[PDB]
Ligand SMILES: CCN1/C(=C/C(C)=O)Sc2ccc(OC)cc21
């Protein structure tokens with residue numbers, strides 16, 4: 683029922699979420715949690731939204747998931763001040779996640795996804 687691309691995206695998601703042990707990025711940030719958030723952050727993202735996008739087959743490539751992942755981390759560094767736990771978590775998550783989503787790792791996954799096609 684799921685494509686090789688969807689399955690790879692879900693495996694990468696599990697690796698990225700393990701780097702968020704405090705679960706700060708699990709769910710959408712609301713204006714109840716973060717006053718004025720919606721006026722500061724115009725393109726919100728979180729892991730639960732990414733998971734739903736995978737399930738709905740909204741991602742056409744791993745790079746599109748990588749873009750959403752970077753956006754998620756950047757949003758938290760834009761809204762939160764550097765001293766806060768949320769900013770510090772976002773900086774660490776972004777750095778760790780960019781190594782999980784390295785261009786060379788992505789290329790290798792693309793190859794194996796492509797191999798399942800035109801058989
Ligand atoms: C959901 C945790 N969290 C945020 C997460 C991200 C990704 O930004 S930002 C923030 C601000 C206040 C708060 O508890 C008053 C929590 C809080």
Ligand SMILES: [Cl-]
Nearest residue numbers: 783784785786
């Ligand atoms: Cl890279």
